Amino acid sequence: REKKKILAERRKVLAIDHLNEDQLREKAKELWQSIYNLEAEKFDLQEKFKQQKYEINVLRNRINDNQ
Amino acid sequence: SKISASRKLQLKTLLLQIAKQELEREAEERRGEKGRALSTRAQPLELLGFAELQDLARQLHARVDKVDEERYDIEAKVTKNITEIADLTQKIFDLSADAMMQALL
Amino acid sequence: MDDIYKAAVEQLTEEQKNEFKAAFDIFVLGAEDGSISTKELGKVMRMLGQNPTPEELQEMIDEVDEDGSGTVDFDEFLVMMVRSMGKSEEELSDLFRMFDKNADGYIDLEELKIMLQATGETITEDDIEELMKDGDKNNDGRIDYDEFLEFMKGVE
Ligand SMILES: [Ca+2]
Ligand SMILES: [Ca+2]
Ligand SMILES: [Ca+2]
Q1: B60: closest CA among B72, B75, B43?
Q2: What is the residue-wise DSSP string for C26-74?
Q3: How far is CA B18 from CA A18, A54, C128, in A?
Q4: Domain limits at A35?
Q5: Among C82, C59, C61, C67, which residue's Cα sits nearest to residue C2?
Q6: Is C48's Cβ below 8 Å from some Cβ in B?
Q7: Distance between CA atoms of C51 and C46, rounded to whole angstroms?
Q8: CA-based nearest distance A64→chain C, Å
Q9: At what angle do helices C109-117 and B5-41 cross, to 10 degrees?
């Protein structure tokens, strides 16, 4: 029984557990659209992370050799 | 020099000419890699029973709160990399004719 | 950035080298050594709508003085002409990764040879030699990021 845990799970109840079946139709759609868009942002943020490890490693080689 | 500087320059230009093409080829590979990673991580929607249609909409709502946290954690790693990249780059940085031809001839 | 001007000098049409020789012979009208000293470069500059200083005048002579005789001869004059007739660093970095295939952070001789063969043009033993010792300006068999920038100066 956590205060911040009980309140967190209530976000579903306040947003979903109360209304239409025809609105739940066009509401569960936009909920997936949000995941897909956030899953796309996560892919690109992962790809940029790979390129930075190369960018950083090349810098570590340059800073050393130029000393 | 063993070869002409005109050939030396022609070869340098063809090296970048394909290195660019490998980069755009790399982007097309990354574009396909994304769509495949999205059909796996974001299996598209398809239908239901008005009662047990809801516990999926509840599950989607809980997914958004976790996806955006995973998106934040990788973002803050990219953010800290930007700080170090600009910091590392700061360290290393420390270490007429045609107007004449007409007015002559 | 130097051997990019000699290429332009080499590809000058003999109808362009004629106009330059003709304009060069007016340039040097009345010079003892038949070459552009500071008097000659002085007149044609102040009369070209300018007025450089005697010191500032020499740094245009010495910018293409591959002789050291304080006088721009015709051959140096062609380099002087092509100097007044590239690639951004941020873009050359993105391409530096394509060479570095093993992703170590340097461009060894093998990665250079693979790119050269991928150009479709016929590579020789002397093309590979001269290119590597041109880019590798300390003879360590590899081209680090700082040299690769000097290697691709002004390349289209
Ligand atoms: Ca001279
Ligand atoms: Ca390498
Ligand atoms: Ca080197």
Answers
A1: B43
A2: HHTTT-TTSSB-HHHHHHHHHTTT----HHHHHHHHHTT-SS-SSSB-H
A3: 59, 21, 17
A4: 3-65
A5: C82
A6: yes
A7: 4
A8: 11
A9: 90
- Inter-chain CB proximity B98 and C126 less than 8 Å: no
CATH architecture assigned to C5-82: Orthogonal Bundle (1.10)
Tell me which residue has tokens 């490998």.
B22
Q: Which residues contact B26 (CB under 8 A, 6 or more apart)?
A: C98
Length of chain A: 67
Cα–Cα distance, C51 to C53 (Å, whole number): 7
Cβ B104–C27 below 8 Å, yes or no?
yes
CA gap C73, C58 in Å, rounded: 14
Does the beta-carbon distance from B9 to C7 stay under 8 Å? yes
- 3-class secondary structure, C144: coil
Find the angle CA(B13)-CA(B16)-CA(B20) to the nearest 5 degrees. 140
Entry field: residues in chain C: 156
Tell me how crowded residue B58 is: count the other CB atoms within 10 A of its CB.
Answer: 18
- Which residues of chain C neighbour B7 with C-beta distances below 8 Å? 127
- Can you give the residue ranges of every domain in chain C? 5-82, 89-149
CATH H-level, domain C89-149: superfamily: EF-hand (1.10.238.10)
Task: Measure the CA–CA gap between B87 and B68, rounded to whole angstroms.
Answer: 28
Instruction: List Cβ neighbours of C42 (8 Å cut-off, separation of 6 or more).
Output: C52, C54, C57
